[PDB]
Amino acid sequence: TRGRVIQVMGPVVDVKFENGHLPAIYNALKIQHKARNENEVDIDLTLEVALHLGDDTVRTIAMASTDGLIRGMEVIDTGAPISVPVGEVTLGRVFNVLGEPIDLEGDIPADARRDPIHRPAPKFEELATEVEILETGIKVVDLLAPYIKGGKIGLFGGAGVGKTVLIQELIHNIAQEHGGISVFAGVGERTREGNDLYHEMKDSGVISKTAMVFGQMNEPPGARMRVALTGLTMAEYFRDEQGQDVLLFIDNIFRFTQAGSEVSALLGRMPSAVGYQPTLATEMGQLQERITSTAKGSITSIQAIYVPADDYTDPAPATTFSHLDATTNLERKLAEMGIYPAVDPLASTSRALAPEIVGEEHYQVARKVQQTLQRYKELQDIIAILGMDELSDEDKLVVHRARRIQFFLSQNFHVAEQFTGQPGSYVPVKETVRGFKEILEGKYDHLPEDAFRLVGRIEEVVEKAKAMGV
């Protein structure tokens, strides 16, 4: 019926039950205690079962601080894993790991629908047999690093390159075109940046189509390693019930794995290489296999990854890099010169850039642009600098078209219209292929470079140069 506390060693607790009444693994248990005198404090705690040790004892991990616990307290078995609310009631609100609102707009009614946090991955016979391309509406992404429905993308960048603007633009474009929602999960990051993102999303207006879950540095190891699953189960409902295409953003996947190690040794497990838990790839696989493209809808996830000390051979980045399909690199150099977004065109990679996926025309145009940019990068540095400038023919034209193509990858976003009068554009992929091909052929070689700046389709560029006096 009810268990009692045996040991309290940090974030790990031991509970003893009656014979033949042990809870299953992954269940949730509750401690609710009121002080009986001045030598006691009130307790409201949730625990998750981890191991069966034998002799009617189980070892559990706490979801909050364990200060104030007493050997002999009474524990209640809930009967099921952690359950979070799902549906339209979670749109525009902020939750914690247990599925409780941390804003001040009220509580979800107890007569709602709640889904468990742990479930198996979709089976082989109900996956997508074809690779499909996701239409974002950006120009550099849709040309040099296309995204995939149900894929995983690694976003590389930090401060001063503006990745929150890219996040908001993706949310807005996907919601407007494909009618999808977004879920943001912050896993063990700074609280200041979470507040900043919440207020930016409130200002833009993309909050009403997003659900936010936060578990950050201040929280125990147990809460940091079970918060991505709450966002995942909030997102899966829309794919499996409304048949939508959803986006899932993860603030730091690395922290997830890190949190696991912080409890592994306390559970009584021998260490593996570099002091990591023996069950590392299994945990990462059980997480990342639940986001796929089934026959109804799809979940595509953008994940930000921090590499410790820029060491890419560390077990955690090495394990998580085998699940990624594309990478998107944001560079400060392009942000200084006024290219928005600051996506690096020569360092962004994708596995969808192949003639059998996008097409022959797309592939040829993209490869021509890439080699032109590489030629510019090689030539402009060792030559034309240090007083070795020269004006060879076919080198005037190469830099002419390269400069006219580098500035056409910039775009005007809808979320940036609050600081700038331009409404913003959504450019399909055929249009940008046509525009880049036309620029490559030299048809638009008789215009100044200022016309190719913060513009959508190629034709609009002409109108710009019409009003510039040229």
Binding residue positions: 157-165, 193, 340, 351
The token pair that represents 385 in the structure block: 């600098």
Is 385 among the residues that bind other proteins (CB under 8 A)? no
Contact range with other proteins by CB under 8 A, out of 64-72, 85-93, 125-133, 161-169? 125-133
How far is residue 78 CA from its own chain's centroid? 32
And the tokens for 139?
Answer: 């120009």
CB-nearer residue toward other proteins: 144 or 454: 144
Among 208, 322, 380, 420, binds other proteins (CB under 8 A): 322
Catalytic residue among 189, 219, 236, 331: 189
376, containing H or E segment = helix 360-382
Q: Detail the DSSP E strand segments found in 63-215.
A: 74-77, 83-85, 94-95, 114-116, 133-134, 147-148, 152-156, 182-187, 210-215
- Identify the residue among 288, 301, 406, 432 touching other proteins (CB under 8 A): 288
Q: Work out which of 217, 318, 337, 468 binds other proteins, going by CB under 8 A.
A: 318
Q: Which of 285, 234, 200 minimizes the C-alpha distance to 96?
A: 234
Whole-number Å distance between alpha carbons of 322 and 455: 36
Interacting residue with other proteins among 65, 321, 396, 422 (CB under 8 A)? 321
Binding mask 24-63 for other proteins (x = CB under 8 A): xxx-----------------------xxxxx-x-------
Residue from the set 37, 313, 392, 418 that interacts with other proteins by CB under 8 A:
313
Q: Does 383 bind other proteins (CB under 8 A)?
A: no
Query: Which among 158, 193, 165, 195 is positioned nearest to 417, based on CA atoms?
Result: 165
Q: Please check whether residue 85 is in contact with residue 13, taking contact to mean a CB–CB distance below 8 angstroms.
A: no
**Contact status: 7 vs other proteins (CB under 8 A):** no
Which residues are part of a known binding site for Mg(2+)? Answer: 164, 193
Exposed e or buried b for every residue in 194-213, given b needs 16+ CB within 10 A? beebbebbeebebbebbbbb
Counting every residue written for the chain, the total comes to 470
When asked if residue 278 is in the footprint of other proteins (CB under 8 A), the reply is: yes
Pick between residue 23 and residue 435 the one whose CB is nearest to other proteins. Answer: 23
Shortest distance (Å) from residue 364 CB to other proteins: 12
For tokens 């007083």, what's the residue? 387
Q: Is 233 in the site for other proteins (CB under 8 A)?
A: no
Pairing relation of β-strands 114-116 and 182-187?
unpaired
Please confirm, yes or no, whether 189 is among the known catalytic residues: yes
3-state secondary structure of 105: coil
Distance CA 127, CA 134 (A): 17
Q: Does 295 bind other proteins (CB under 8 A)?
A: no
> Which of the residues are catalytic?
163, 189-190
Which residues in this chain contact other proteins in the complex, by CB under 8 A? Answer: 20, 22, 24-26, 50-54, 56, 118, 120-125, 127-131, 150, 269-273, 278-279, 281-282, 284-286, 288-289, 292-293, 312-313, 318, 321-323, 349, 354, 356, 367
